[PDB]
Amino acid sequence: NVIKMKSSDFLEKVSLAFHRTQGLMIMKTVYKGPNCIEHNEALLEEAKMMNRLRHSRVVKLLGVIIEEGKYSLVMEYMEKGNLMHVLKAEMSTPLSVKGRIILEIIEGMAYLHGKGVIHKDLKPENILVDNDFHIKIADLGLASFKMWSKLNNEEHNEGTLYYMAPEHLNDVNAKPTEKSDVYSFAVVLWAIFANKEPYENAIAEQQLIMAIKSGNRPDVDDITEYCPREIISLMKLCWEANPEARPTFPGIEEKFRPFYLSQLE
Numbered sequence: 622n623v624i625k626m627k628s629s630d631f632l633e634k635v636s637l638a639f640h641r642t643q644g645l646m647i648m649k650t651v652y653k654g655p656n657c658i659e660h661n662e663a664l665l666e667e668a669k670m671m672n673r674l675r676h677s678r679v680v681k682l683l684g685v686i687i688e689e690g691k692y693s694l695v696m697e698y699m700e701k702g703n704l705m706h707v708l709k710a711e712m713s714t715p716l717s718v719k720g721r722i723i724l725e726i727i728e729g730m731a732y733l734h735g736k737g738v739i740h741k742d743l744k745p746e747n748i749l750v751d752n753d754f755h756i757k758i759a760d761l762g763l764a765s766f767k768m769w770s771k772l773n774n775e776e777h778n779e780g781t782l783y784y785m786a787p788e789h790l791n792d793v794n795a796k797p798t799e800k801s802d803v804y805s806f807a808v809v810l811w812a813i814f815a816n817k818e819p820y821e822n823a824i825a826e827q828q829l830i831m832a833i834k835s836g837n838r839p840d841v842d843d844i845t846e847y848c849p850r851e852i853i854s855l856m857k858l859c860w861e862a863n864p865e866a867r868p869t870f871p872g873i874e875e876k877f878r879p880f881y882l883s884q885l886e
């Protein structure tokens with residue numbers, strides 16, 4: 622359940638926050654300025670609906686702060702940051718854990734798709750990791766928070782394409798689908814084993830967009846550490862140019878869970 626929390630609930634732009642009674646949380650204040658009270662109940666219900674997406678692999682929206690001219694969202698604190706932070710830490714992550722993170726991403730995405738939620742911005746920054754290396758899927762760019770996103774863009778307030786299905790590059794009139802997210806997943810799979818972002822040799826945005834739409838993909842030979850052949854096959858399957866040929870997350874799960882259990886766990 623969501624709390625209509627108050628600024629007063631916290632000790633004296635994104636920022637750490639210590640709730641006076643509940644503890645560490647993440648706050649994004651989305652808006653400062655004129656009153657716009659007419660938006661209040663829609664902002665609250667939208668937060669309620671996002672808060673109703675509950676699953677072990679989906680991040681919890683803990684509270685909102687709705688005040689005279691200050692609107693803030695409050696999220697649970699994931700101790701190890703996002704997945705790229707984890708992949709780029711000095712201490713390595715063993716193959717078993719990488720396999721589990723993949724399985725858990727599949728579960729969160731199957732759950733979301735089960736509820737009719739198309740993420741549209743899946744990427745390592747939206748995959749958060751707790752102290753025990755379990756993951757939760759987040760929506761930090763507010764791609765599913767329609768009203769808060771508009772609130773964030775209002776005039777009187779005070780981006781990466783690596784993971785975008787090629788159908789959406791240079792085409793803002795295509796509607797994203799579940800297969801859009803599957804493509805993103807494919808590139809996340811590559812990042813997990815490369816321990817870095819793809820396309821490091823790309824020079825210009827227009828060169829990248831045109832290259833990916835012509836069929837360029839992340840360089841599989843650039844994976845130095847060991848990567849199971851089945852996982853190389855999965856990412857190639859998941860980033861096929863034809864969206865209708867990419868599998869669903871339930872189809873992915875039925876393949877990868879028995880492979881995870883028998884080979885990587």
Ligand SMILES: COc1cc2c(cn1)N(C)C(=O)[C@@H](NC(=O)c1nc3n(n1)[C@H](c1ccccc1)CC3)CC2
Nearest residue numbers: 647648649671674682694695696758759760761765
């Ligand atoms: C650093 O930038 C950000 C951006 C934000 C935040 C922290 N750092 N805070 C404080 C949040 O609360 C974020 N919330 C989410 O991303 C969020 N909340 C939920 N989800 N994501 C879940 C979800 C996941 C995927 C799709 C839809 C909903 C349901 C609850 C959105 C705004």
